[PDB]
Design a protein around this motif. Structure first.
Motif, mmCIF file in Angstrom:
data_model
loop_
_atom_site.group_PDB
_atom_site.id
_atom_site.type_symbol
_atom_site.label_atom_id
_atom_site.label_comp_id
_atom_site.label_asym_id
_atom_site.label_seq_id
_atom_site.Cartn_x
_atom_site.Cartn_y
_atom_site.Cartn_z
ATOM 1 N N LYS A 93 -8.971 8.289 17.786
ATOM 2 C CA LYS A 93 -8.870 6.967 17.189
ATOM 3 C C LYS A 93 -9.580 6.950 15.844
ATOM 4 N N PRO A 94 -8.883 7.406 14.797
ATOM 5 C CA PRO A 94 -9.486 7.464 13.460
ATOM 6 C C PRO A 94 -9.842 6.075 12.948
ATOM 7 N N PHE A 95 -10.900 5.969 12.152
ATOM 8 C CA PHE A 95 -11.205 4.713 11.489
ATOM 9 C C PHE A 95 -10.348 4.657 10.231
ATOM 10 N N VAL A 96 -9.571 3.587 10.092
ATOM 11 C CA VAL A 96 -8.585 3.473 9.026
ATOM 12 C C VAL A 96 -9.192 2.783 7.812
ATOM 13 N N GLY A 97 -9.044 3.404 6.651
ATOM 14 C CA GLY A 97 -9.567 2.817 5.428
ATOM 15 C C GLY A 97 -8.475 2.344 4.502
ATOM 16 N N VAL A 98 -8.747 1.268 3.773
ATOM 17 C CA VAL A 98 -7.855 0.833 2.713
ATOM 18 C C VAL A 98 -8.554 1.130 1.392
ATOM 19 N N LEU A 99 -8.070 2.129 0.670
ATOM 20 C CA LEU A 99 -8.618 2.412 -0.650
ATOM 21 C C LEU A 99 -8.455 1.151 -1.504
ATOM 22 N N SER A 100 -9.552 0.662 -2.072
ATOM 23 C CA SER A 100 -9.546 -0.621 -2.766
ATOM 24 C C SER A 100 -10.248 -0.508 -4.100
ATOM 25 N N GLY A 120 -1.602 8.192 0.450
ATOM 26 C CA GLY A 120 -1.292 7.682 1.778
ATOM 27 C C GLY A 120 -0.214 6.609 1.673
ATOM 28 N N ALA A 121 -0.247 5.621 2.567
ATOM 29 C CA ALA A 121 0.690 4.496 2.514
ATOM 30 C C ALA A 121 0.198 3.415 1.533
ATOM 31 N N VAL A 122 0.888 3.251 0.414
ATOM 32 C CA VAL A 122 0.360 2.372 -0.630
ATOM 33 C C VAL A 122 0.551 0.896 -0.291
ATOM 34 N N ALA A 123 -0.290 0.055 -0.872
ATOM 35 C CA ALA A 123 -0.265 -1.371 -0.578
ATOM 36 C C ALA A 123 0.917 -2.062 -1.246
ATOM 37 N N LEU A 124 1.447 -1.434 -2.296
ATOM 38 C CA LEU A 124 2.527 -2.010 -3.088
ATOM 39 C C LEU A 124 3.838 -1.787 -2.359
ATOM 40 N N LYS A 125 4.479 -2.875 -1.942
ATOM 41 C CA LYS A 125 5.641 -2.758 -1.066
ATOM 42 C C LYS A 125 6.761 -1.912 -1.664
ATOM 43 N N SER A 126 7.076 -2.146 -2.934
ATOM 44 C CA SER A 126 8.234 -1.501 -3.552
ATOM 45 C C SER A 126 8.103 0.021 -3.544
ATOM 46 N N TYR A 127 6.893 0.520 -3.770
ATOM 47 C CA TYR A 127 6.694 1.961 -3.817
ATOM 48 C C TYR A 127 6.511 2.502 -2.404
ATOM 49 N N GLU A 128 5.803 1.747 -1.569
ATOM 50 C CA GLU A 128 5.544 2.187 -0.198
ATOM 51 C C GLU A 128 6.839 2.397 0.580
ATOM 52 N N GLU A 129 7.821 1.525 0.379
ATOM 53 C CA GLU A 129 9.052 1.674 1.147
ATOM 54 C C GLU A 129 9.793 2.969 0.790
ATOM 55 N N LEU A 153 2.051 -7.023 -2.396
ATOM 56 C CA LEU A 153 1.313 -6.132 -1.496
ATOM 57 C C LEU A 153 1.414 -6.612 -0.048
ATOM 58 N N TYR A 154 1.320 -5.688 0.912
ATOM 59 C CA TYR A 154 1.346 -6.050 2.339
ATOM 60 C C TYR A 154 0.180 -6.949 2.734
ATOM 61 N N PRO A 155 0.475 -8.014 3.493
ATOM 62 C CA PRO A 155 -0.545 -8.954 3.962
ATOM 63 C C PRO A 155 -1.757 -8.276 4.595
ATOM 64 N N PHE A 156 -1.531 -7.261 5.424
ATOM 65 C CA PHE A 156 -2.632 -6.618 6.132
ATOM 66 C C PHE A 156 -3.580 -5.870 5.192
ATOM 67 N N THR A 157 -3.076 -5.440 4.040
ATOM 68 C CA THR A 157 -3.947 -4.826 3.039
ATOM 69 C C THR A 157 -4.844 -5.863 2.355
#
Ligand SMILES: OC[C@H]1O[C@H](O[C@H]2[C@H](O)[C@@H](O)[C@@H](O)O[C@@H]2CO)[C@H](O)[C@@H](O)[C@@H]1O
Ligand SMILES: [Zn+2]
Ligand SMILES: [Zn+2]
Ligand SMILES: [Zn+2]
Ligand SMILES: [Zn+2]
Ligand SMILES: [Zn+2]
Ligand SMILES: [Zn+2]
Ligand SMILES: [Zn+2]
Ligand SMILES: [Zn+2]
Length: 366
Positions: free
Chosen positions: A253-260, A297-306, A86-90
């Motif tokens: 400036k939307p507030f960005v959420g990470v679905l967790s 949206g943009a998923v945390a899993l790198k392989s699928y997100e790319e 997963l991406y570090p920022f997530t």
């Protein structure tokens, strides 16, 4: 024990999630029940406090700091191999007091969604929307409808010219420095209220109404997240997803959420919950099942997100995200959201002036 109960919001791909759960049951014999209670983000801390509630709770990361502070979440322990997926920022979004308290799933941000047949060239500014609405009202259409009941949707405009939640300073949020009552916040909410008082929008408009209007071609624009695209696809409206309009020359400036996905501290199925999340959900195939139901949206899993990054709708999502900011996850977020919800509802409906509404919000949020 020997069962998994999952809560996810009703606007997300809970049927897709349930399909992952069925695969899990086929493999392990463990039944997975996906539910989507109303107001689950408020319901969880109440029932979990008694040790009840779901085994796994899905929500944007902003609520998780408070859950964690209340000892409601189990600490998750993914190993290095898994974390590298997963991406570090997530991972950053689900860290509280140094501990990881949830699995990140996807990055969410609001975009401007527009009807290409009614509006081939969408407005770059909020300021031009009133005139556009007047032009459309002549045709029995409106320019823009979006959920006015949840401050998540109005925040991007309020923050545009300088509104903010808590001041960030070198790794810590100063909870005594709130920016809901400054000139920027006031200008943004005033503009919104003006739209409503002048009948360009309706104080009544909520999520279902706005979604209805856009998907039936009654309004030229709406503001929503990736989860909404699936229903538009079905509606056959010819839509685009684009950068939010500017206000006073400044980006929305939307507030960005990470679905967790958090695990209930009171869960007797913590090991199974981890197995499900790491090895069933957070896989190419698992996320695809959910995404195909309602886009994540943009998923945390790198392989699928790319792979997802090739989608211009996702590009638009992240362009808006970059103009916005990641939500804090501190316990004070709940008070913040309640304060601003009240303020926006009271000002929009004319119950209070903008100045009075926001002054009360400044007090309530801090
Ligand atoms: O309106 C306040 C509300 O905003 C956010 O909730 C979002 C959520 O993050 C999205 O996933 C989407 O489903 O819409 C919700 C708004 O209806 C915060 O996450 C939430 O804590 C806050 O109350
Ligand atoms: Zn039930
Ligand atoms: Zn529901
Ligand atoms: Zn491993
Ligand atoms: Zn007007
Ligand atoms: Zn009404
Ligand atoms: Zn209708
Ligand atoms: Zn219909
Ligand atoms: Zn173990």
């Amino acid at each position: 024990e020997g069962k998994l109960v999952i809560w996810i919001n009703g606007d997300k791909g809970y049927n897709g999630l349930a399909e992952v759960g069925k695969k899990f049951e086929k493999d392990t014999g463990i039944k997975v029940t996906v539910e989507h209670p109303d107001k689950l983000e408020e319901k969880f801390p109440q029932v979990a406090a008694t040790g009840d509630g779901p085994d796994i709770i899905f929500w944007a990361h902003d609520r998780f700091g408070g859950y964690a502070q209340s000892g409601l979440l189990a600490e998750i322990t993914p190993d290095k191999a898994f974390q590298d997926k997963l991406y570090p920022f997530t991972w950053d979004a689900v860290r509280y007091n140094g501990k990881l308290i949830a699995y990140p799933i996807a990055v969410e941000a609001l975009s401007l969604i527009y009807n290409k047949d009614l509006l081939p060239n969408p407005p770059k500014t909020w300021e031009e929307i009133p005139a556009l609405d007047k032009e459309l009202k002549a045709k029995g259409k409106s320019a823009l409808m979006f959920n006015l009941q949840e401050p998540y949707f109005t925040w991007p405009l309020i923050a545009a010219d300088g509104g903010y939640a808590f001041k960030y300073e070198n790794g810590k949020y100063d909870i005594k420095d709130v920016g809901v009552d400054n000139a920027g916040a006031k200008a943004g909410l005033t503009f919104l209220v003006d739209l409503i008082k002048n009948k360009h929008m309706n104080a009544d408009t909520d999520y279902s109404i706005a979604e209805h209007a856009f998907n039936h071609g009654e309004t030229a624009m709406t503001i929503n997240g990736p989860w909404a695209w699936s229903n538009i696809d079905t509606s056959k409206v010819n839509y685009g997803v684009t950068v939010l309009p500017t206000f006073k020359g400044q980006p929305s400036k939307p507030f960005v959420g990470v679905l967790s996905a958090g695990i209930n501290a009171a869960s007797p199925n913590k090991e199974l919950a981890k197995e499900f999340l790491e090895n069933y959900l957070l896989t190419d195939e698992g996320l695809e099942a959910v995404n195909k139901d309602k886009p994540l949206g943009a998923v945390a899993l790198k392989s699928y997100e790319e792979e997802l990054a090739k989608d211009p709708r996702i590009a638009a999502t992240m362009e808006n995200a970059q103009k916005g900011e990641i939500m804090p996850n501190i316990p004070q977020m709940s008070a913040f959201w309640y304060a601003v919800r009240t303020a926006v509802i009271n000002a929009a409906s004319g119950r209070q002036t903008v100045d009075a509404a926001l002054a009360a919000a400044q007090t309530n949020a801090a």
